[PDB]
């Protein structure tokens, strides 16, 4: 849930 998987 970090990197590309983090929602912004």
């Amino acid at each position: 849930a970090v990197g590309i998987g983090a929602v912004f």
Epitope: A1, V2, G3, I4, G5, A6, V7, F8
Partner: antibody, heavy 115, light 108 residues
């Protein structure tokens, strides 16, 4: 977004390696993770660290205290400094933008650590 | 240090064959895994995200699947333009970690 790495391609051992990532098409204070990742000879990939859009940063423990990632929000650039380099730091250095299930990478820039 | 182990470093294939690359995570990473494709002289490019989802522009012949510690990238009907190195990556937590990469070769 477009990312472009720049900096000296030859660094003497024990000195510091500095690279700049120039970002265009997106604001580095707006969103995501802004990373440095390097690729060794033999193609192994290692993630070095990030600076977040809010200026917080974190690093791969494999790098000890050697690494610092920093930014210029006026120029929309972020920066890598890696202290006390050795030959095993020879690599192609990439900067990336990650988040929201997107990944953008620069073309990378080779740095050779040699005397 | 979540370690991503890829099966074999080099795989020989023929055009039109299905090829499957596998990556085994040391801990449970859920669905948070990406596959990257890297052609010579190019940066890696994201191929699959969230283990099953093709990225923008990626052809339908690429599929991925798996959960837990086991993940697969599938090339259905290999093409010559798929000659490349492939890397799994986990984004469950930092530090990000990549598989060692698999190089495809075409038989002729």
């Amino acid at each position: 977004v477009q990312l472009q790495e720049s900096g000296p391609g030859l660094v003497k051992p024990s000195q510091s390696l500095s690279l700049t990532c120039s970002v265009t098409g997106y604001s580095i204070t707006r969103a995501y993770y802004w990373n440095w990742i390097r690729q060794f000879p033999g193609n192994k990939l290692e993630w070095m660290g990030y600076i977040l859009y809010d200026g917080r940063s974190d690093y791969n423990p494999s790098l000890k205290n050697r690494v610092s990632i920093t930014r210029d929000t006026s120029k929309n650039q972020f920066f890598l400094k890696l202290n006390s380099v050795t030959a095993e730091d020879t690599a192609r250095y990439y900067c990336t933008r990650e988040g929201n299930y997107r990944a953008y990478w620069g073309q990378g820039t080779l740095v050779t650590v040699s005397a | 240090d979540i370690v991503m182990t890829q099966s074999q470093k080099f795989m020989s294939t023929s055009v039109g064959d299905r090829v499957s690359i596998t990556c085994k995570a040391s801990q449970n990473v859920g669905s948070d895994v990406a596959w990257y494709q890297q052609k010579p002289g190019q940066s890696p490019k994201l191929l699959i995200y969230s283990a099953s989802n093709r990225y923008t522009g990626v052809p339908d012949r690429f599929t991925g699947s798996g959960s837990g510690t086991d993940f697969t990238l599938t090339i259905n009907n290999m093409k010559s333009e798929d000659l490349a190195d492939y890397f799994c990556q986990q984004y469950s937590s930092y530090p990000l970690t990549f598989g060692a990469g698999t190089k495809l070769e075409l038989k002729r």
